[PDB]
Every structure is written in structure tokens, then in C-alpha cells.
């Protein structure tokens, strides 16, 4: 009865160093709905993070958007950390800005 999250990490607008943007972590296809999602900056939890209202797809699996305003820089590393009952340890997905 358990489906593991598919995790995407991306910016709202194409990223350019020095310019405010939003960092997104989109988690979909998961069940049950209990999930913990953190956005990380250089390994550290970002504290001002919002998320969408829980909703679900035609196959009943859930999806959520977590997001925070940020200004990308060259050196800063961002990631999304997701914990779910299906994962043996919290999954960390680094923001791959070069895709």
C-alpha cells in the first residue's frame, strides 16, 4: 500500500546568480501522506519554507510543493531532504541547476 516520493528540485525562473528567485522541491507519487521535507542551504535547514496544500493525482498518490525565496550564488549548495516511511534514510536530492 506504500509508494515512494519522486523528488524534483528546481527554481521557479531560470537561475541567475545575484537575482531573487524561488527554490522549489516538488514531491509526488507518494503514499501514505505523512512526509517530512526540508530545504537545505550548504547543508543547513532553511527556516522560512512554505508549502502547498496536500492534494492527489488520479492514482490517489499525493503531491506537495515546498518553496522558499532565495538568491542563488555560485558557491551556495542547495538540496531537498525528504523523509518518508518508504525510505531507509532521508533522501537528499541536490539542486542540479545545470540541466
Amino acid at each position: 500500500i506504500q509508494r515512494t516520493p519522486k523528488i524534483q528540485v528546481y527554481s521557479r525562473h531560470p537561475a541567475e546568480n545575484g537575482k531573487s528567485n524561488f527554490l522549489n522541491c516538488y514531491v509526488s507519487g507518494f503514499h501514505p501522506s505523512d512526509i517530512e521535507v526540508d530545504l537545505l542551504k550548504n547543508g543547513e535547514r532553511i527556516e522560512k519554507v512554505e508549502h502547498s496544500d496536500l492534494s492527489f493525482s488520479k492514482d490517489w498518490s499525493f503531491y506537495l510543493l515546498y518553496y522558499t525565496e532565495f538568491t542563488p550564488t555560485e558557491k551556495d549548495e542547495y538540496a531537498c531532504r525528504v523523509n518518508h516511511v518508504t525510505l531507509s534514510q532521508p533522501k537528499i536530492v541536490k539542486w542540479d541547476r545545470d540541466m
Binding site: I1, R12, F22, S33, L65, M99
Partner: protein, 274 residues
Amino acid sequence: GSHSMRYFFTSVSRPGRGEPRFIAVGYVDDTQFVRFDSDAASQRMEPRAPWIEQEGPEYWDQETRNVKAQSQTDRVDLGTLRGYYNQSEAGSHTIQIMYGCDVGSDGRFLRGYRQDAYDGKDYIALNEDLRSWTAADMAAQITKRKWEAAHEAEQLRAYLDGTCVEWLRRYLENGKETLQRTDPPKTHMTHHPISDHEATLRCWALGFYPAEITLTWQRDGEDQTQDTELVETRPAGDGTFQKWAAVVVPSGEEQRYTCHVQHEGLPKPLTLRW
């Protein structure tokens, strides 16, 4: 084009940690316009689109009453279905409900629907004629007999093909400046060597609305059904959507591959070649 109005409901029991979590969301097309979250502070149905804010205090009171009644009904149903499925009180379980209606571009009713799930699997659904139910198993059939005896389909039908349509037409008028906009995808391709001998081609669609879209890879015109990686369509966070599709190809053969992009906002389907 055609339009839809949908409400989505999730109730999650949390034994020994208080009452079930309950989250309701309403959408017109792919645009959220109201929400209720049992863990939020207001305990009110709340606006999430600019064009619903003009609704008066009687509307917000009624929507709040009716979403709280849905919550209370789900709370009872969580306990009932645990009995039907012979489960213990210790575990957390989930009820999900979706219902709504579609109208055509001239406002006519097209379709109504209602479907319910338990622990992420079908439980019971209203059939397309809005007169009959389909239960997913012998437990759900108990609910079907109850709903048949209560004449629930007739009550629900008057909403799904009447009241639901009337409100959806009002919202499309409230929101005309934004709900009738279609944004076609802005598309491009990227190329990333993964070794001396292979490269990833990735086809990108950005900034599109509504969310429905199709990206497919061909090689010499033959659909490359497998060997393609395709992500779930995702929200940008500004009301538009994004999607990409990728394929790994031998270096030197990139020009045999084409990406094809279909979206209701495109006059012709788009073909991209590296």
C-alpha cells in the same frame, strides 16, 4: 475551451495523537481557489485566488460549515471502514474523496463525477450516468447498499449536474481575466555529455498552462517508448507548469532524435532537433 471545478478531500487518522488531519482544496481547472486545513489557525474555508475574494461573508460561512461537515463525516467513516476491513485501532488510515463537474466552452454541462478511496485504493465511485455506484470490493458494497437505500445518488446528481455547474459558471465570470488564459509552452533542448561517447538530450517545456502536455522522443521517426526518462509535470509556483523528457544517445548521432511537444495552446505540435 472546456472547464472544470473539483474539490479534493483527505482525512488521515492519527491514533493517540488527536483527531484526524483533514485537508480540503477546491480548483477551477488547474487553479486552486479555496482551502481548508484542520491544523491551520483560522478554522475557516480560506480564499486562494484573487477572483474568489469578492464572495460575501454568507459564502465563507456556508463553505466553512459545509467543509466542516465533510470533515465530521470522514471522521465517522474512518471508524466504519476500519470495521469493514477488520483492522485494529492502532494504525493510521486515509480516506480521499474527489468530486466535481466539467462544462464546455459555451457553459453546457459535460460530465459530473465523484470517487472515493481508502488507504490509497479505489473504494466506491459514482458511475458516469450519475445514477449508479461501482464498489471496488465486498467491503465497499456495504456502503453502496447504504447509499442506494438513502437515494444518495439522486441528491449528489442534483449537485454535480446542477449546483456545481451554476457555481462553476459564476467563477469563470468572476475570474474571466485569468481563467480563460492559455499559456503555450516555451521549449528548448539541452545537451550534456555523460562520457566521451554518449550524451543526454533533454527536451524542456516551460511556462505552460493548463498542466496537460505531452513530450515524446523519436529516433528516425520511431517512437523511443523506453530508453526515455520523463519527469512528472510540476508547478513553477507562479501558476504555470514545467516538464522535461530526456534520452541518452551515442555521440555523433544527436541529429537522428526529435522531441515532439503537444499542448492545447500550440497551433501546431512542435518538433525539436539538436
